Amino acid sequence: KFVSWKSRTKYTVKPVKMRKSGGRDHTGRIRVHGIGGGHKQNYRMIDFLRFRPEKEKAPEPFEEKVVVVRYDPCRSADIALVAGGSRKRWIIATENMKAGDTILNSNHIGRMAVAAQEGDAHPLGALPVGTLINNVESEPGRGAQYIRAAGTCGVLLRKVNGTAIIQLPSKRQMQVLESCTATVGRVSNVNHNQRVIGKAGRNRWLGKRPNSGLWKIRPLPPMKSYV
Template structure:
């Protein structure tokens, strides 16, 4: 009898595992400190299963998974739903490009730019809409790096090495086939100004330049909603509707005399190899 109970105890201990509380709570968005039964709940968005359905987005209140403030001035606001925007405009590397039709251009409360619903074959997805994109347009996505430059049409996606100099681009990759990371906000774009070997130089609106591979893809044109920076909120109550909390009021608005001084342009940013992935081993720190 004692031997049987001892064997059951050993089997039970074998099933035990160390639970990393930070790992189990990193996707739990909350406006307060996570405690009690709620700290083991996972409310992560399954990114492996794509859907056009708007997904409920819990408010974070500017707090991280540990309940501490990470972004000040954020809280409240109207309820929002997350749309899974696909930033990877990856097309075939050989043959004809992928052709998709724009079904609709919609407003997205989670970003400053508009998004477009595009479909090709049996698949539909959200992408960042360009400035003049409208329903019924046909857009192309190609991954073929051509020696002769292609005709740059707004909304099409090509490797930077296939585009002519002077082209305005957005949704720019910094590493090949990793998805657009730069120039995704409303009205933003970069300009392809130079090609050096297998590298391309892009000038951003801040006059700073970045050096990326010619295989990095980008979408031709400027991001939609170009008048976003001219939007006037108008009242404090409308600011709270957008989830913007009031300032402390101690710092007054500066006159034209005060402000930032003219500084030299920063050096070129060179993106060659992506960073190594984070280690799966978790260490306890004091």
């Protein structure tokens, strides 16, 4: 009888009502522990393909205007409503975004290095080595999946041929095609890790239930005696 709430097909900026799980599945059994209750939250559909040219428009660099930088219940980072043409869409906001700012979204792969302005989306080929990036996408056109948490920045270590090495926030090095799109700068809420929950009740507000109260090398035969 469990139907997922993720049943909306059309992108909108209207907040969407979310149903909580509690850690259960469609079967109805707990699959993950520590999830329950919390404050009621609304989902704001984020757009992780920064370079999405508007409908009935050419695939060339375009600009968008930042309406407001909001607080997101569903994320550690903060989101920004950005407007361009006749379209509004939520996006992830970088460290220094402000209302009224203008951000570029470019398809052009610069033969030479492109000056890096935080918040603008360029193909990794355009960027020069060493520039901090966020909201990287593993495959061209896939959509951002990495470095989209609060304060996380990835360095662009190297570019050779049509491939670049991206150092993920965990220091795990990844490689992608330079056609892949990344957003310059680190993600907002750079001080998210400095927060102090302070009391147990605050965690219960965040939908986190308390942990359970419950409290292996095998020697080889030569070593079994000497264990």
